[PDB]
A and B are shown apart, each in its own frame.
Chain A
Amino acid sequence: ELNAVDAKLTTDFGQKIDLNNSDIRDFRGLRGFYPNLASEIIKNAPYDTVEEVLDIPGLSETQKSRLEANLGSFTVTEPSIELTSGDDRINPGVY
């Protein structure tokens, strides 16, 4: 039987960047995200849908415009504790 993150990689977590589970390094392909906007996204997790990432308080016009410019790169899955415990979304042991 698959473990938890293998079951996640079967889902849309393996195709693009999950606002609830994906690490901060996955936000580097989106211009203007790493490190500030990605840190705010990870800090304000979880999200029920993708659109409430535009409802994060503290978002200036530039951050809102860059999140609207790349809304099609994001999904939401159920927040999995295997990728979240001990701040693995910031440092999962990968350099």
Chain B
Amino acid sequence: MESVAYILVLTMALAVLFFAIAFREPPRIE
């Protein structure tokens, strides 16, 4: 059942990668 835990933690990292690219705070010149 450890395979579920490994899949969850890898999926959490990949979801963090998606949300950090797609939904970053936009860099604004001001």
Direct A–B contact present (CB less than 8 angstroms): no
